[PDB]
Amino acid sequence: LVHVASVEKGRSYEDFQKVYNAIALKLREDDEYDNYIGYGPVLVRLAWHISGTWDKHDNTGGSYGGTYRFKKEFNDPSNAGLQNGFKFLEPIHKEFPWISSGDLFSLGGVTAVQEMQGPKIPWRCGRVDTPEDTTPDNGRLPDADKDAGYVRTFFQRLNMNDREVVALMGAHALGKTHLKNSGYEGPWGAANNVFTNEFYLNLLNEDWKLEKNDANNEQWDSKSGYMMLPTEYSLIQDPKYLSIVKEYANDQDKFFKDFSKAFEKLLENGITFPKDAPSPFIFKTLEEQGL
């Protein structure tokens, strides 16, 4: 399977920057969502879930095809709650009918992170919508009740090494778990719609106690009201992962620079970019544009 990036016909930087501005202006406007967290966290979860289905072995899944638009992947139990991010983006797709689905889902992720004061993520356009039958089967996304052994082996399918996995995990500073979506409940931290290295500082500094929650699942709860899932808690139980968590807890710039590289790799896995294709676009934020 080869997927070659085809730029939407006749579109260039300024067109894509208008879709970004539209997503960003609507993030501003709909600030009421989810107890005033806003839609930025469910949008980076949506760009990681449409990208996270990739298998490096046979090049299936990944962001290219925009197959979340189809019922099999839209209704994946692992994707519960993402319907909210989908419904956010739909008025934007109506407004800009020429952009492909995987391009819109992924750019929404880039927009959320840069507008939540995170790092600039380079983005590339060219994902082409493929048919209902290239849609991956359910079960390719990760379990929350597992250990660092599972984490390493799972992320190897998307060929992410230790550092990329820890950098990617820090997007959990954002938003929260919701009992009805995943059987887990609670924020990871206090500033959950601002992108910082808070996740690592909490993982290291709180007095976490293992408790069962109202859905009968274990989770690590802290005195401050925070929570950690069994899978990401084991990132302090693995000697290699823990040295990286401490690195990011101590250095936010490093975390942002690494996060930017890993999230872009995540969003481009499975896609071949021809030599003539446009370079990665670095989109301006509303603020930078005075808007």
Binding site for ligand HEM (CB under 6 A): 41-42, 44-45, 48, 81, 142, 144, 151, 168-169, 171-172, 174-178, 181-182, 184, 229, 231, 263
**Tokens of residue 182, six digits:** 């995943």
Residue of 39, 65, 110 whose CA lies nearest to 263: 110
Residue in 3, 48, 49, 123 annotated catalytic: 49
**Rg of the Cα atoms in the chain:** 18
Q: Are 105 and 123 in contact (CB under 8 A)?
A: no
> Quick one: 124 or 176, whose CB is closer to ligand HEM?
176
How many other C-beta atoms are found inside a 10 Å radius of the C-beta of residue 277?
15
As a whole number of angstroms, the distance between CA 122 and CA 120 comes to 7
Counting every residue written for the chain, the total comes to 291
The minimum distance between CB 178 and ligand HEM, in angstroms, equals: 4
Residue spans of alpha helices (H) in 5-58: 13-29, 33-36, 40-51
Is 3 known to sit in a ligand binding site?
Answer: no
> Quick one: 128 or 234, whose CB is closer to ligand HEM?
234
How many other C-beta atoms are found inside a 10 Å radius of the C-beta of residue 119?
17
Residue in 54, 123, 188, 208 annotated catalytic: 188
> Quick one: 68 or 184, whose CB is closer to ligand HEM?
184
> Quick one: 222 or 231, whose CB is closer to ligand HEM?
231
**Tokens of residue 40, six digits:** 């930025």
Concerning whether 123 is annotated as a catalytic residue, the answer is no
Q: Which residues pair with 176 in a beta bridge?
A: 187
The residue number whose beta carbon is nearest to ligand HEM equals 175
Q: What residues contact residue 276 under an 8 Å CB cut-off, 6+ apart?
A: none
The minimum distance between CB 236 and ligand HEM, in angstroms, equals: 14
Concerning whether 188 is annotated as a catalytic residue, the answer is yes
The minimum distance between CB 69 and ligand HEM, in angstroms, equals: 20
The minimum distance between CB 227 and ligand HEM, in angstroms, equals: 10
Active site residues: 49, 188
Binding-site annotation, residues for heme b: 172
